[PDB]
Amino acid sequence: IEIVLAVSSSVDRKDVVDIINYINEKGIDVWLWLDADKVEEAIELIEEAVKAGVKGIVLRTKKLKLEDIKKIIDILNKYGVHLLIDTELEEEEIRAIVDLAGPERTTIGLKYDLGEKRERLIRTAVELGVRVLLTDVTDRAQAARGLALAGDRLELLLDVDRTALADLRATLALAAKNPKVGLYLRVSRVDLAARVRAVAAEVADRLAFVLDAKNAAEAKALIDALL
């Protein structure tokens, strides 16, 4: 499996390092999903994560515009940072960023809870070949619609603790049937995180688990539940 650490740029750099160290000590790939809340501290986290041995880094662009990314593109490239655009910007700006970094280093990210605005971004991303991540997914109907609109550019962030058993099994089955689809399992509850592992091994299954790094101790026990 792979573990993704979703953090803000202001997260204490120490705790992420021990969690990255802990995950690597078990021989497991660890990725960083970084919110670019403040650019200078994001770069400091990027360098620290790289030195701790992170497998890869995705930067959530947040309020950073094209001009902000231009000033750090050399840093992003040297550290191999994948860009995740938050879809609060217009198609002119998204296309500008996609042109700047390349389609294969850029992902469109939006909560499924959006209406027609969700569908407008999927078509543009599909045309551009950019992967599109739908977050806060809880029902099989949402995943099936995302697969319909986005095809093999689809990525799903599944909210495990808010997903019923039937939807969890169906969404896992959809991922297994469509292996190019990226499935990410956001977990906090230990019992429910271990539950997905048991269900996935019967229905599917690599598994990517998204964890918060707010407290180091709960992260370790959460990591141990996923083994």
Q: Which of 57, 99, 106, 52 is nearest to 78 (CA)?
A: 57
The tokens describing 7, both together, are 């953090």
CA distance 139 to 202: 19
Burial class for 196, CB neighbours closer than 10 Å (0-12, 13-18, 19+): buried
| All structural domains of the chain | 2-226 (3.20.20.70)
- 219 close to 193: Cβ distance less than 8 angstroms: no
Helices (H), the chain: 13-25, 39-52, 66-78, 91-101, 116-128, 140-150, 165-177, 190-203, 216-226
Count the residues in the chain: 227
Instruction: Please state at what angle helix 116-128 crosses helix 140-150, rounded to 10 degrees.
Output: 40
Q: 116-136 in b/e burial notation, b at 16+ Cβ within 10 A?
A: eebeebbeebbebebbbbbbe
CA distance 198 to 224: 14
Resolution (A): 2.3
Give the three-state DSSP class for 61: coil
Radius of gyration of the chain (CA): 17
Which residue's structure tokens are 């690599």?
206
The tokens describing 88, both together, are 């609060």
- 175 close to 167: Cβ distance less than 8 angstroms: no
Residue 9 is classified by DSSP as T
> How many other C-beta atoms are found inside a 10 Å radius of the C-beta of residue 9?
21
The tokens describing 104, both together, are 């294969």
